C-alpha cells in the first residue's frame with residue numbers, strides 16, 4: 001500500500017489471489033503462458049529457457065543439490081532445463097512472484113529486485129524491507145525446493161549483514177535466522193561450473209535423458 005510502511009510480509013496467498021491461478025493447468029493455457037516466459041519445449045518431456053549463470057538463484061542451489069551433473073550440463077547449454085512436471089509450477093510461481101512483488105514494493109519502506117554482488121557472481125533479492133538503516137531481505141518461495149530458497153535467503157542475510165530474513169510461503173511465513181554456513185554452498189557451485197569435466201550424477205534416474213549423457 002502506497003503511503004504506509006511494512007513491519008513484516010504476509011503469506012503470498014494472503015496478498016495475492018492464488019485461486020485465480022489454479023485455472024492454468026491445461027496445455028492450451030500452458031502454451032500461451034510459455035510464450036511470454038520465453039520457455040520452450042526442447043524434448044517431449046523437457047522444457048527450457050535461457051539462463052545467465054553469472055546470476056545466483058534458488059534455481060542453481062536447487063539444482064546443485066539435486067544433481068551437480070545437471071547443473072554442469074545446463075551451464076554448458078546456456079539453458080535452464082525444466083521437467084514437464086514442474087514447468088507449470090515455475091510459470092505459476094513466476095506470476096505469483098510478480099504480483100506479490102509489485103504489491104509489496106508499493107510500501108514506502110519496501111523495495112524490489114535489490115541487486116547485490118557476490119564477487120564474480122551477482123544476486124537479486126526478491127524484496128528488501130528497510131526497517132531503519134538495516135536491510136531485511138525477503139525471499140519468495142516459488143517453484144523450487146524449500147531448502148533451496150532458504151539457503152538463497154541465508155546468503156542474502158549474510159551479505160546484507162541482517163539479523164534475520166523472511167521466507168514467504170503460500171499460506172504462512174518463516175523467519176530464517178542468519179547462517180553464514182550457507183555461503184559455503186557458494187564456493188562449491190563456483191567450482192562445479194568452472195570444472196572442465198562433468199561431475200557424477202547424484203540422482204536415482206535422470207528425467208532429462210538423453211541430454212545429461214550427451215553433455
Ligand code: FES
Pocket residue numbers: 066067069070201202203205206207208209212
Ligand atoms: S539429472 Fe542427474 S544426471 Fe541427468
Ligand SMILES: [Mg+2]
Pocket residue numbers: 058126139140141142149
Ligand atoms: Mg524467491
